Design a protein around this ligand. Structure first.
Ligand SMILES: *[C@@H](O)[C@H](CC(C)C)NC(=O)[C@H](CC(C)C)NC(=O)[C@H](CC(C)C)NC(=O)OCc1ccccc1
Ligand SMILES: *[C@@H](O)[C@H](CC(C)C)NC(=O)[C@H](CC(C)C)NC(=O)[C@H](CC(C)C)NC(=O)OCc1ccccc1
Ligand SMILES: *[C@@H](O)[C@H](CC(C)C)NC(=O)[C@H](CC(C)C)NC(=O)[C@H](CC(C)C)NC(=O)OCc1ccccc1
Ligand SMILES: *[C@@H](O)[C@H](CC(C)C)NC(=O)[C@H](CC(C)C)NC(=O)[C@H](CC(C)C)NC(=O)OCc1ccccc1
Ligand SMILES: [Cl-]
Ligand SMILES: [Cl-]
Ligand SMILES: [Mg+2]
Ligand SMILES: [Mg+2]
Ligand SMILES: [Mg+2]
Ligand SMILES: [Mg+2]
Ligand SMILES: [Mg+2]
Lengths: 212, 196, 222, 195, 226, 204, 233, 196, 195
């Protein structure tokens, strides 16, 4: 698994891979490492598949209850903290989670919170989580700017996952893209790495070590 | 420890050595392993001294309370109470107990209760670390409906050998006779039983 | 020390068609190198046009299926005999599995049926409740032998159209029920050859709008 | 987390705390503020196991803020430090203890004196002129033993603190990405934005 | 694995299944477990495959040299003694479990060998993971004064018991008959009760289905003249 | 920790009508990290081909060792070694390290130059010979390869048909293994011509 | 979590045309010591069911009490206790199977392997297995412990599949069971010569045979076996 | 395993069961544990089958070479060679051996060699896992200068009980008689010795 | 030690190696050169267990220098790399193995081509356009996969190397105190004194 998320001029970009493994065995190439909690909130999934799925769909139930009771959209800060306070109760029991809670509100603007099964909760502009996180960081840090177009930012996120999919054995399958704006998130398609790699190589002139 | 109980014509006899050990040190050379849970229901104790004492004390309490309400309990009933304690607390106990008693209706009966907490009714029973060395002797020499004198000789000879080979067994040979006549205590010293 | 888990072997396979769905599994039950039974059913009709199998440790598998069948029964009581949709069943099973997150059901669960649009559906679970809808999924002992074959022969992976040389892929044409059963039978025949825990018999449950049908085929008994 | 320092001068307390957050092989953040304001004239820095640190700090913060509202009065640094120690002393014999070390820097408005308290996760409290947690003290205490005076100014305290951070940046293996410095005095708490 | 040995009137017969496994996976479906030590001394091996092969070849090699040195046909007790002393020396680390059988000038013989170096004598023996299934058959149907035809039947039936009931055993039945005053007959695949049924479909692909990047001729020939 | 699955990789071999085929992936890694996509695992000594999976240092070491031994064989015997003979040499060489073994999974492939008979064979890390008629598999995705080969394979395939069968067996097995892939090579071998084809596959 | 102390070995069984047969030896072992020689490990429940139990004997005696209590409880407020609402084999099994899985789930198992053999109301044969893990399965032949490895192969030669059951008579089935018990005496180091056998037939009912012995044993060939290889005398 | 050797008036008799086990599986039910190291010097083997076979083979070799140079060895000499192997390789061996032989000068002699590698000359000896159950029986029933028929009955009855109680012991009872008359092999089957 | 990098461009090989030496809690040195010249046109960088690294490098250096004197000829980079691999492959089955990973950068004067070889302590050799040992590759290979060309100049190679070091300085937890960079080309070996 490899997941990332970053803040920029046009909101937030969220990009994830699609591989799931059991040891060296590739169990699935078609998993959703991103969960849509609500039209304005996204959650990334890294670590234990079950732990992340279960508690993030649960998080969506809690966020829905909040806006029913308070007649107002939940803040990204409050949503992230519900999840972080929950996993802290289970600390030591063996939960395995590395997640980014991404969203946009009026009071906050575009916001990303890294939430962890160890109880860690961090606000930040850029995060990469998973076994291929280091590979994604390399591309992101060298090409990141605040003044990026939605088109260019989407590509950078897509490209950063590709970099990790290539090198990290436990990352791959396909790339799922999301763009989060003032008016909510927007899905930007499933991109098979088997086709994307050769496309990027030809067009970008990169990956000269590989032959094709 | 070498303990045994044997049914015979007139009732039942319990037998035991008198050695208690802490490793190789004999903490007590004159121990009484034949203990009373009711007038004519006794038991032989093996394993942990603490566990078997605690259990026997509880059983004596249960049978005293049984007697106050329902009259004299059967030997089977006494064995059941032992079993219930040994079986339900098997994880925390190290107790090998032989229950023996005399009714007028059922006469002499013997029940053995090993580590697991299982119950086995038998004509005679042997237990303790020293019993291993006399399985052969006891199987070959036991007869049903023996006399009192024959049964005393059988137990005396059997435990004599158990003591001879087992380091954890020794001292005097204590015996308790259970018949319609009453309760008789017997004792046999080393000079007597070693020369057999 | 007491080990509360065991491994009863076996292998299962679920394939989703355009207007149907199949859930297959061998009938062999084992411990270590011994055979317990040559015919011990593993795939079950759970009602509401849903079939289910929980492969791995059979005691946990039987317990889970038993609990889900129970869940279907109470769903009818509590919600005016409403039909339990395949997607709703899947979510319910997640909560059954995660409910024992810290003492798991040691099983690979697969369910099959039709979605609310009438299209074929297969859902796959891990032991602690993570789930995902899929077109194709094998589970159990010989899952590693079967899945690659299905990637190739169901989703036409690594296959291209002759003459173009890698430029144009093979088009993803839909498969009939007769074509799917052929792939299932060949999958289990091949798995039986190379995996010692697979064999004896093959039982397939097919699900259509008309209901749930069964088909049985012999497998090698060595 | 890693490095937290404290120094008490003539008329103020200065706390320095690293900015890095490292979860395994990667540095996830380089601008993290490892501190919470407990009251207008009391600041607490912290370092220990992930999750526990923030959870504990915010829990203490909430309790002191509750006290302030209830009594309409600010607790003395000595009183706050004693409350914090008791919570950690309670915690060490729990099912799962808080693995958190803290420094408490406060200005006592009654006595008109700055005060620095060092408390570890066991609940071991000491009042000091200068303090540190973890491996920080191994490098910095020798410099502070030499250069420190009770009558130093705040500017002199910051210069002596720069000398400590420079030594840490030279001899420590981990890159802690600099420090956030905060001053606590009679006028309250403020952050030195250029360090 | 299931291997057996059965004595009869005028000789001895051994048999084996043909399955080789790597954990739960079948590595080879038609493995040959019947090894030749000398022309009229054959052995069947269970346990570590490389060990049973290696130890059989070594002793078989030394037996041949011994036979040439002494100008005599090799004896089963010689193969037995050499095997057990080798295996004992290595303290069970050479995981070879063998059934050794043969005819020689002394007569017909049947032995088993354990990896730690112990030997046993018998009229009927079985080794391997399917030895219990096989021994159940042998204990039910064995008798004294068996004919050649009866012994082959009993042996193959004992192997079948292993094939069907033991997961470590399967596929075919190999047999070797060693009769006194005769050539030993090796009956490879004596029974074939596990042929795979015809597949439902052909998986032959259209030519050009696979994507290719580069082609090139490989020079396997030596450096050329002129 | 487990030496046979640090670097990763796979090899597969098949027989056809008057031909044999042997193929391998190109990956070399350090556990999760992919290091090289040009690490070929098939070598040839004359007309005898040898594929080796497992610990890469031992793969390199054994190639160098068998090159050494086959070159001396040729000088002394005045002829190239045959597949049947080479198979025995590999077995001998591995078993001499019985209690300190090379962590490898070799696969021999070739055609006997005199009889014309197609030949393949496989081994475990300590010498045991697996001489199959149909196919041999080795590597971290051996289970996957067994499943593909058992279903796709049929006897007496023509060279150009055999190429398709083995290529699809390898590709689809490699795509279900994290430590295999990053390219692939297939050798088609006839009695007096050998074709080498590099396959286009997904690079993740 | 515990360890078994006094134990019982194999229980073997099979179906035949009109019913089921089950058998088990009368030994209670204490490790390598063959301590108790008169232990009945087949426990009938009514006139239509027999429960055969292996493993820990103290746990067996507990289960024996549960079944005794089950019969008592079923009779309460039940006028058809000896007729339509009598205990079936399927009821008795499912109860035990429930208990076994519950006990394993509390990490405090009943250290046993159990086979419930019987005949249902409609005359159908019932034969199902359950153990300390709560694992269950049914088959024409069932056996526990060593019987699984040695008896099943022999009994499966008689009834290899479902279609072989109507073709198998009670005489042929009993013969196979008795032979299997002999084989286990030859080869199981924790078995005894003495055993009990039970037949449940849909026509003739429950026949319980006690004090059976393994007979027609082959030992004479032992006299010819000398040494371990080279020895002649 | 139940093995024993008993001296009597005319010489010495060795006795043994025939069971070999791998855990609870009986790998061989007709084993010959009475093995020959010289014409009238035999041994009973217990413990590891591999170890005791390897040792016995080496001893037979040593005594064959002794005989070629110095003539017939004594039973004491044979016991010494066993001891030397068992004592010097005690760390790597699991072998409990009873050596028994007949001279014309010394008549019947019995030497037992337990795990440590110590030697003990005795009138009779018992060993193996099954011996534990007959220490009592054998001590009570052994007499010096018994007849051949009495000694056969003693061994038969003793091993009968050892087999009855020990799971690791069973099968047939093999016996080897060593006298001036020669070497006689005896065998007793279950139907004969179980009913004793 | 920690980070060692290598990149092969059009006409040269560039090796970068960290300067820090950390023995436990302290950084004992910040100017350490983790490389040895094996021959005029062959350079080897190294990293692994303390002591073993230098001992192994100097041992290899001595052997190649011996070969050079004996034959009055410089071995090809390919030949030197094979010799080094064999020594490590021999070492891994020894009583106490050399715990050393190396990069060998050389310019082949015969073929007029730069060559970079990566060898780990097991004796695993691979020829590469760019390589790394330890955790360095986890960060740097993604950048190199993107930016690298076979026809790059030496100046472009240094710029791409600066981008790699900048990423390492940003995301790695350990302070490796910068790198010493060395270029290997047709004219021999030289050090870039300002980096
Ligand atoms: C990548 O991080 C990915 C993210 C998810 C959104 C898929 N996670 C995994 O791949 C993760 C790898 C970790 C645990 C090393 N895999 C799983 O969690 C995995 C998912 C299934 C679908 C393969 N499940 C798993 O490994 O089994 C849980 C288990 C196994 C055995 C017994 C009890 C529980
Ligand atoms: C012989 O079996 C005899 C019978 C008793 C009922 C008197 N048992 C012992 O002598 C017994 C043997 C040991 C191995 C259990 N010794 C003790 O129980 C010993 C007596 C005290 C007074 C020293 N207690 C003892 O060693 O305490 C530790 C302990 C506790 C429980 C179980 C084992 C050991
Ligand atoms: C059945 O007993 C059979 C007898 C053989 C003579 C064929 N045994 C096996 O097939 C055996 C399984 C168990 C007993 C080891 N298989 C192997 O030994 C196996 C054969 C080849 C096909 C791989 N070898 C193996 O798994 O190698 C791994 C290994 C590593 C170290 C030590 C031993 C084995
Ligand atoms: C009874 O003591 C009998 C006497 C022998 C001389 C026949 N011994 C055994 O049956 C013996 C008991 C075990 C506990 C040592 N069994 C074996 O030695 C057994 C025989 C083979 C043919 C299976 N071997 C065995 O289990 O190998 C492993 C081993 C090796 C050395 C010591 C213990 C165990
Ligand atoms: Cl006491
Ligand atoms: Cl033996
Ligand atoms: Mg990848
Ligand atoms: Mg099979
Ligand atoms: Mg892959
Ligand atoms: Mg016995
Ligand atoms: Mg490397």
């Amino acid at each position: 698994t490899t997941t990332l998320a970053f803040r920029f001029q046009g909101g937030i970009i969220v990009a994830v891979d699609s591989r799931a493994t059991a040891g060296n065995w590739v169990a699935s190439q078609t998993v959703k490492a991103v969960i849509e909690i609500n039209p304005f909130l996204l959650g990334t999934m890294a670590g234990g598949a079950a732990d992340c799925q279960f508690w993030e769909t649960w998080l969506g139930s809690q966020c829905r209850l909040h806006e029913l009771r308070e007649k107002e959209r939940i803040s990204v800060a409050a949503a992230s903290k519900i999840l972080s306070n929950l996993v802290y109760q289970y600390k030591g029991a063996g939960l395995s989670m590395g997640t980014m809670i991404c969203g946009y509100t009026r009071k906050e603007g575009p916001t990303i919170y890294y939430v962890d099964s160890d109880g860690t909760r961090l606000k930040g502009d850029i995060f990469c989580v998973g076994s291929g996180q280091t590979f994604a960081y390399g591309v992101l840090d060298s090409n990141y700017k605040w003044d990026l177009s939605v088109e260019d930012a989407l590509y950078l996120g897509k490209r950063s996952i590709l970099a990790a999919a290539h090198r990290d054995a436990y990352s791959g399958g396909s790339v799922n893209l999301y763009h989060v704006t003032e008016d909510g998130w927007i899905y930007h398609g499933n991109h098979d790495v088997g086709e994307l790699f050769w496309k990027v190589k030809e067009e970008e002139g990169s990956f000269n070590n590989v032959i094709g | 420890t070498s303990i045994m109980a044997v049914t015979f014509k007139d009732g039942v006899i319990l037998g035991a050595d008198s050695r208690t050990t802490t490793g190789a040190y004999i903490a007590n050379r004159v121990t009484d392993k034949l203990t009373r849970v009711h007038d004519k229901i006794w038991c032989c104790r093996s394993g942990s001294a603490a566990d078997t004492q605690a259990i026997a004390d509880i059983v004596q309490y249960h049978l005293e309370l049984y007697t106050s309400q329902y009259g004299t309990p059967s030997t089977e009933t006494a064995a059941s109470v032992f079993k219930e304690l040994c079986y339900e607390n098997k994880d925390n106990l190290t107790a090998g107990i032989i229950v023996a008693g005399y009714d007028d209706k059922n006469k002499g009966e013997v029940y053995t209760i090993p580590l697991g907490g299982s119950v086995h009714k038998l004509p005679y029973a042997i237990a303790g670390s020293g019993s291993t060395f006399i399985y052969g002797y006891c199987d070959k020499n036991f007869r049903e409906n023996m006399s009192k004198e024959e049964t005393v000789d059988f137990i005396k000879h059997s435990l004599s050998q158990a003591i001879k080979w087992d380091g954890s067994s020794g001292g005097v040979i204590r015996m308790v006779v259970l018949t319609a006549a009453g309760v008789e205590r017997l004792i046999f010293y080393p000079d007597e039983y070693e020369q057999l | 020390q007491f080990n509360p888990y065991g491994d009863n072997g076996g292998t299962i396979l679920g394939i989703a068609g355009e207007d149907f769905a199949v859930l297959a599994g061998d009938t062999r039950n084992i411990t270590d190198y011994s055979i317990n039974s040559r015919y011990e059913p593993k795939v079950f009709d759970c009602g509401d046009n849903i079939v289910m199998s929980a492969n791995g440790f059979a005691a946990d598998g039987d317990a889970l299926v038993k609990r889900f069948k129970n869940s279907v029964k109470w769903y009818h009581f509590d919600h005016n005999d409403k039909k339990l949709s395949i997607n709703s069943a899947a979510r319910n099973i997640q909560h059954l599995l995660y409910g024992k997150r810290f003492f798991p059901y040691y099983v690979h669960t697969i369910i099959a049926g039709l979605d609310e649009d009438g299209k074929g559906a297969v859902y796959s679970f891990d032991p602690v409740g993570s789930y995902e809808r899929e077109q194709c999924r094998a589970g159990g002992a010989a899952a590693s032998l079967i899945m690659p074959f299905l990637d190739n022969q169901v989703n036409f992976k690594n296959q291209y159209e002759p003459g173009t040389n890698g430029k144009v892929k093979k088009p993803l044409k839909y498969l009939s029920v007769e074509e799917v059963i052929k792939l299932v039978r060949d999958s289990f025949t091949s798995a039986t050859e190379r995996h010692i825990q697979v064999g004896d018999g093959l039982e397939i449950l097919i699900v259509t709008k008309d209901g749930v049908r069964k088909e049985f085929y012999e497998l090698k008994r060595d | 987390m890693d490095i937290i320092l404290g120094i008490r001068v003539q008329d103020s307390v200065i706390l320095a705390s690293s900015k890095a957050v490292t979860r395994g092989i990667s540095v996830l953040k380089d601008s993290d503020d490892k501190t919470r304001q407990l009251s207008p004239h009391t600041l607490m820095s912290f370092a220990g196991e992930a999750g526990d640190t923030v959870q504990f700090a915010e829990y203490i913060q909430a309790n002191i803020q509750l006290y302030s509202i209830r009594e309409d009065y600010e607790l003395s640094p000595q009183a706050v430090s004693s409350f914090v120690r008791q919570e950690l002393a309670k915690s060490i014999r729990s099912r799962r203890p808080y693995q958190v070390n803290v420094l408490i820097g406060g200005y006592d408005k009654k006595k008109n004196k700055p005060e620095l308290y060092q408390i570890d996760y066991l609940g071991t409290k000491v009042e000091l002129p200068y303090g540190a947690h973890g491996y920080s003290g191994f490098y910095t205490f020798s410099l502070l033993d030499h250069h420190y005076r009770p009558d130093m100014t705040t500017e002199e305290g910051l210069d002596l603190l720069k000398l400590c951070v420079q030594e840490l940046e030279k001899r420590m293996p981990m890159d802690f990405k600099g420090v956030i410095v905060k001053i606590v005095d009679k006028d309250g708490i403020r952050q030195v934005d250029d360090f | 694995t299931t291997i057996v040995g059965v004595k009869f009137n005028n000789g001895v017969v051994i048999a084996a299944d043909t399955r080789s496994t790597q954990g739960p996976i079948v590595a080879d479906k038609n493995c040959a477990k019947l090894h030749r030590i000398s022309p009229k001394i054959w052995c069947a091996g269970a346990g570590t495959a490389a060990d049973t092969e290696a130890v059989t070849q070594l002793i078989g090699s030394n037996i041949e040299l011994h036979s040439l040195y002494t100008s005599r046909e090799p004896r089963v007790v010689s193969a037995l003694q050499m095997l057990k002393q080798h295996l004992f020396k290595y303290q069970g680390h050479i995981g070879a479990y063998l059934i050794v059988a043969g005819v020689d000038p002394t007569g017909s013989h049947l032995f088993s060998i354990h990896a730690h170096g112990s030997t046993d004598v018998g009229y009927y023996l079985s080794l391997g993971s399917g030895s219990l299934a096989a021994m159940a058959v042998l204990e039910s149907h064995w008798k004294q004064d068996l004919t050649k035809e009866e012994a082959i039947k009993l042996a193959s039936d004992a192997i079948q018991a292993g094939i069907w009931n033991d997961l470590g055993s399967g596929s075919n039945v190999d047999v070797c008959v060693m009769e006194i005053g005769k050539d030993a007959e090796y009956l490879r695949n004596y029974l074939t009760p596990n042929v795979r049924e015809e597949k439902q479909k052909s998986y032959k692909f259209p030519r050009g289905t696979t994507a290719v990047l580069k082609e090139s001729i490989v020079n396997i020939c030596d450096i050329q003249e002129e | 920790s487990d030496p046979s699955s640090i670097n990763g990789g796979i090899v597969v071999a098949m027989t056809g009508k008057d031909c044999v085929a042997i193929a391998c992936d190109l990956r070399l890694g350090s556990q999760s990290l992919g290091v090289s996509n040009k690490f070929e695992k098939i070598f040839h000594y004359g007309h005898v081909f040898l594929g080796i999976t497992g610990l890469a240092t031992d793969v390199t070491t054994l190639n160098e060792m068998f090159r050494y031994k086959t070159n001396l064989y040729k000088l002394k015997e005045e002829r190239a070694i045959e597949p049947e003979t080479f198979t025995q040499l590999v077995s001998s060489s591995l078993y001499e390290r019985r209690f300190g073994p090379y962590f490898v999974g070799p696969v021999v492939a070739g055609i006997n130059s005199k009889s014309g008979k197609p030949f393949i064979a496989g081994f475990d890390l300590i010498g045991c010979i697996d001489e199959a008629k149909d196919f041999i598999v080795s590597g971290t995705a051996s289970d996957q390869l067994f499943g593909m080969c058992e279903s796709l394979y049929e006897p007496n395939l023509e060279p150009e048909d055999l190429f398709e069968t083995i290529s699809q067996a390898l590709l689809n097995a490699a795509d279900r293994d994290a430590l295999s892939g990053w390219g692939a090579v297939v050798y088609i071998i006839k009695k007096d011509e050998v074709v080498k084809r590099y396959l286009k596959m997904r690079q993740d | 979590t515990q360890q078994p102390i006094v134990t019982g070995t194999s229980v073997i069984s099979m179906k035949y045309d009109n019913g089921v047969i089950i058998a088990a030896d009368n030994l209670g072992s204490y490790g390598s010591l063959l301590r108790f020689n008169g232990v009945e490990r087949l426990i009938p429940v009514g006139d239509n069911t027999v429960v055969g139990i292996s493993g820990d004997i103290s746990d067996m005696q507990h289960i024996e009490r549960l079944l005794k209590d089950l019969v008592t409880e079923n009779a309460y407020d039940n006028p058809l206790a000896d007729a339509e609402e009598a205990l079936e084999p399927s009821y008795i099994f499912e109860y035990l199977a429930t208990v076994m899985y519950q006990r394993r789930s509390k990490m405090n198992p009943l250290w046993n392997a159990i086979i419930v053999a019987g005949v249902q109301s409609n005359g159908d044969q019932f034969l199902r297995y359950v153990n300390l893990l709560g694992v269950t399965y049914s088959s024409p032949t069932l056996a526990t412990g060593f019987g699984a490895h040695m008896a099943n192969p022999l009994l499966r030669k008689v009834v290899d599949r479902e279609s072989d059951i109507p073709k198998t008579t009670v005489q042929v089935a009993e013969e196979a069971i008795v032979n299997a018990m002999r084989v286990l005496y030859y080869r199981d180091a924790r078995s005894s010569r003495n055993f009990s056998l039970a037949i449940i037939d849909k026509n003739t009912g429950l026949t319980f045979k006690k004090n059976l012995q393994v007979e027609n044993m082959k030992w004479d060939f032992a006299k010819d076996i000398k040494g371990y290889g080279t020895q002649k005398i």
